[PDB]
Amino acid sequence: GIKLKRLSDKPVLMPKAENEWERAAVFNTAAIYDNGLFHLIYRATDIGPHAKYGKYISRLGYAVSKDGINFMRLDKPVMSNETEQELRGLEDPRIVKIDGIYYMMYTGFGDRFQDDYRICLATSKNLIDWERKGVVLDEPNKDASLFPEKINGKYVMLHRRYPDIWIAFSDDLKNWYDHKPILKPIPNTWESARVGIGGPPIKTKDGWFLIYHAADDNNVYRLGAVLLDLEDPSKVIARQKEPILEPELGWEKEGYIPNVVFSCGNAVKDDTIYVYYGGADTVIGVAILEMKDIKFHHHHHH
Amino acid sequence: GIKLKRLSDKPVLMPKAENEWERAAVFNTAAIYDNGLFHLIYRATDIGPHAKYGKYISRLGYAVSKDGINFMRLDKPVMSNETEQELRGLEDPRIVKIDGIYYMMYTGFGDRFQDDYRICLATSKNLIDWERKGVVLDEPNKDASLFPEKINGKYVMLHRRYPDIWIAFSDDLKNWYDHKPILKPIPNTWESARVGIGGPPIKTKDGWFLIYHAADDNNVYRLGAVLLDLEDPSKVIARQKEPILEPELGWEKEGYIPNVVFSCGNAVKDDTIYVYYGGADTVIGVAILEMKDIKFHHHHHH
Amino acid sequence: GIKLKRLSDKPVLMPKAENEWERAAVFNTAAIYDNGLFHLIYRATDIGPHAKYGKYISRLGYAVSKDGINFMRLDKPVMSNETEQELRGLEDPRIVKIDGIYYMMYTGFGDRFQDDYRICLATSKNLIDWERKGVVLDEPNKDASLFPEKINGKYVMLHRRYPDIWIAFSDDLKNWYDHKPILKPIPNTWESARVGIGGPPIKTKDGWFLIYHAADDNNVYRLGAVLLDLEDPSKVIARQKEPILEPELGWEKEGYIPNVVFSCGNAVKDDTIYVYYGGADTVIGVAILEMKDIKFHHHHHH
Amino acid sequence: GIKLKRLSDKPVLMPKAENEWERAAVFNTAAIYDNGLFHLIYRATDIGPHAKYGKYISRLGYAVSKDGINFMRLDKPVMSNETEQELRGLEDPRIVKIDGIYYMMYTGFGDRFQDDYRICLATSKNLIDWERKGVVLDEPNKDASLFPEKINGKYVMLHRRYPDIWIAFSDDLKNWYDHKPILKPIPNTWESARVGIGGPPIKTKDGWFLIYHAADDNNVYRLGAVLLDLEDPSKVIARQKEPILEPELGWEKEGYIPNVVFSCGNAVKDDTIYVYYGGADTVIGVAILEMKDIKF
Numbered sequence A, B, C: 001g002i003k004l005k006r007l008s009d010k011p012v013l014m015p016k017a018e019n020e021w022e023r024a025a026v027f028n029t030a031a032i033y034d035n036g037l038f039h040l041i042y043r044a045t046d047i048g049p050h051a052k053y054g055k056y057i058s059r060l061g062y063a064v065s066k067d068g069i070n071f072m073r074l075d076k077p078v079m080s081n082e083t084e085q086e087l088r089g090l091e092d093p094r095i096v097k098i099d100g101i102y103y104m105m106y107t108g109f110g111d112r113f114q115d116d117y118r119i120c121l122a123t124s125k126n127l128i129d130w131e132r133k134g135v136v137l138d139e140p141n142k143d144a145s146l147f148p149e150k151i152n153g154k155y156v157m158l159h160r161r162y163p164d165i166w167i168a169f170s171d172d173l174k175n176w177y178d179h180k181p182i183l184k185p186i187p188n189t190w191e192s193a194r195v196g197i198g199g200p201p202i203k204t205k206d207g208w209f210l211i212y213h214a215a216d217d218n219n220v221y222r223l224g225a226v227l228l229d230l231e232d233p234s235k236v237i238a239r240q241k242e243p244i245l246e247p248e249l250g251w252e253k254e255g256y257i258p259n260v261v262f263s264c265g266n267a268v269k270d271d272t273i274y275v276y277y278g279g280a281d282t283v284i285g286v287a288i289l290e291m292k293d294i295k296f297h298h299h300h301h302h
Numbered sequence D: 001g002i003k004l005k006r007l008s009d010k011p012v013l014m015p016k017a018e019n020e021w022e023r024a025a026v027f028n029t030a031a032i033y034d035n036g037l038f039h040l041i042y043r044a045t046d047i048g049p050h051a052k053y054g055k056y057i058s059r060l061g062y063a064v065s066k067d068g069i070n071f072m073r074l075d076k077p078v079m080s081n082e083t084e085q086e087l088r089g090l091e092d093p094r095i096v097k098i099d100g101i102y103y104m105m106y107t108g109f110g111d112r113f114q115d116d117y118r119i120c121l122a123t124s125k126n127l128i129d130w131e132r133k134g135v136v137l138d139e140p141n142k143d144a145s146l147f148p149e150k151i152n153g154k155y156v157m158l159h160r161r162y163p164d165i166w167i168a169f170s171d172d173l174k175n176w177y178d179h180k181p182i183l184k185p186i187p188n189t190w191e192s193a194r195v196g197i198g199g200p201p202i203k204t205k206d207g208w209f210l211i212y213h214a215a216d217d218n219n220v221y222r223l224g225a226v227l228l229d230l231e232d233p234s235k236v237i238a239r240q241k242e243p244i245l246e247p248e249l250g251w252e253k254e255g256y257i258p259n260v261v262f263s264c265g266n267a268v269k270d271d272t273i274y275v276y277y278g279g280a281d282t283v284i285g286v287a288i289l290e291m292k293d294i295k296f
Ligand SMILES: OC[C@H]1O[C@H](O)[C@@H](O)[C@@H](O)[C@@H]1O
Pocket: A028, A091, A092, A142, A221, A257, A260, A262, A278, A281
């Protein structure tokens, strides 16, 4: 089946003690290949990302690489906690580029009352200067992204009304309609508790290739793969039974949150997918998948 | 009760990003007052000391102060990871001075196989140039120090066969005998999981004043105090029920490990004890106790 | 007439202790406005750039700003000392963008024998990944740049055969011809010892606007302005008598070399020129000139 | 003749860009061997030490070494500019240890009026905590040190009423008497313009070994050596004609002040003298002399 291949046993990005905003953890990064470079917009916290460590604030960093392994990083966050909806910061960004514009969906965590987090949108032409567009869906939700192109003249988003992956459609990026669930947890498996997107889906000749995450009943996080129909991505063509990535290395199994691999970004250079993922909500790693290796079992049964 | 009094709300020593060896954390320092100055031999790490990626290394720095609050620091470690037993460095030093010689016990962490850490001894005449004397006890152990004077013509050491404070005796500083436990955890209290020495004990008219640490069942670290008989320090005269120091300030409650105060050093100037402690395995603070405020309840009953 | 206006009394970029490559000095930066951002490719040294001990090495950093005053910076150099011609590093880069490609001329300092420095060229599409094209002129020379457009179908460069600004022409960026001097020092003035370009010239309706530097007989460095004919930039239309910028602030007057302002970069946003300059070969500042304020004295007489 | 031997072509101590107080120059250091270590109390400036660079302030740093070559350094100065006599800082310290106490003479530079500099004294038990004792001689003077032992029950100092090395005597370190010149410049030589002590003198079986400095008529600084009588150090028993050290390395010939070697410290371990010197008032080097090679 499909399995992501780690390039080494070492993270590609680690917290940096010198800078308070990224002193504890860097994880769950957006990623895109553009103009001959890999770019990360990474989630960073000052404190370990759980209440037992403290009142962490998530901010978004920028890193850049020629090879997708060795990164340079900017000294200050490119987005910081600047609104009420973002009092506790910005989480788990997903980025696509459409017609010259980068569209980032992230979760603004306000923590002012129960379930005070929202999918928010920001745009950029350059990945450094971000313009907030505000809340996308006025409801507790997260794990959101646009598709990287319009389909049938509409913007399409993925979201996560608990505990399923949902899709929705928009003409104007402000009003969303035709909400429906497209992927659900499966009882008594590695993907029983909840599912959500990983990074944004990638267009393939055979359909939309979507990496997803799931948690089991022991709260272990793994990645999986699903293929969606090109014209109607609400239709699942295939869903791989087995995970494509699971916690194996020491820094995936242990850290601020044990036994987590979690992706918000998949960059493509020359038909190789570079899947960036958080390990234990502490560091960032990379694992690859060649596009020619995207193969699902063909079957037909109700 | 005995309570340590913080000398300020700010650390007295913090990590320094420009020096790799102390970039992440400085904590758990030895301390001694000598020749009109306070001297720290501090534990320092290059990456967070709970990191599950890479291989953090502990090295020993030197700092010096006229007032016990405001420190100057040397730019390079006075002991670095130079033997196999110290591949991952030197931890949690405790120092005493006997007859012109400084005796430092530290934990050498090799990590070459299961439980590869050992109490090790180094000596110096000047606190800068250290001569390794090798492993003290050939067994997994830590939290060790000499007493600062011979007792009945013998050297006495404290150690920590799990989970109790132990003592032992030596005529030649090489062979240790009459090992016995002297202090144990108390169930259902702040000191239930484990106990260990803080810094080396301090001689008083009423007995040996020994600061100890303990962890509770949620791994919160606090300091306590016990008074041992002068001639036979295996005999506990009094043990304070309540802690003398617990995590309260932000940098004691939050850092690389939450809710830790941890001491390896207590310097004495003019009948005031300066207790140096790590906060959250991240920074170093100081709190005082005047000798006249060392008050315990004595008893006479089986 | 023309005077640059400082945007701040503080540097916009300073050396950073934590990073050895830029520990001592950041100065003499290239600059360009692109894709809604100001970008600096800055000269940095590990030790003072006038040190007579050791061997200072110049490497090239990257910084980026939305407003041209407040910069973010990458943690590693985008070009380091990687050839024999660059044993002592890369100096005083000038950048232009032509048809999607950035062309950087810098001085490679080898110091292997007498006068071992050369104008070298590197190209990039993104300002991060630089491809060396090698030595431009096989002779001791410096203070070089392309013009930001071809003229009459040719590439044009400025250089500095001592002590004058020179121009030369090329069809292929490898072979240069029609070398001629275009600007000379003026005896008994602030610009008596030597002249050289500042940043690359900027096209205006009235001609090429070229900031230049000069040294006086006491080695004080100031900036001036000259206007060159559009079609034949060897012809000077006007040269301002007085400097446009001179050392005034404390960090321009004092540092590793006293009384120096020195520019290698002039970014343009919305008809305002942002002139980045080194102060005292130690830090980087910014001063502006609106295009409408480019006014020279003209006359008509033999 | 006596020649100091450099141990390498590299400084032992250089300015540190991270710390403003020592960003430009470290030079002209005191030195002593004590308790198994070499200790430097070094002059440091924030700006090159000439008015053409700016209003430099001299402060005193601490460094320490096991081998006399490879130093560790403290992050802040052990003495900073804290009196009016020291507005522009503390210069060119010389240290001796007598009966458990370190005695440092330095120049306090106030620059408040013409010739506003004074020999000042500070003491310490540990080289870190310094107690000022104030101005030693109320006159423009510098290049001062105690001898490292009392002689005939008196403290003895060297000083520099311009342009000669002087000696003086004291019972109490406050009142100085029996001032006399002991060493003068020699016209038309490398030592024509002025002379001054280097580090404090060192006792030998043959007399007090004193390194001195001199400037020539082009302001080039070199070191020389003299031998003084043990009981009466006002009597010069030998003075070497040729210098023992002169600017040769690039960082001795060029820097903030060209063509300078200048010593304020000479540490002794196992019969070898380690002579620490400023090069070009910018960096610190070391050159050695074995005791058995002190031959006039
Ligand atoms: O901790 C595991 C996982 O839980 C969250 O809720 C996710 O959205 C991620 O932010 C994180 O990696």
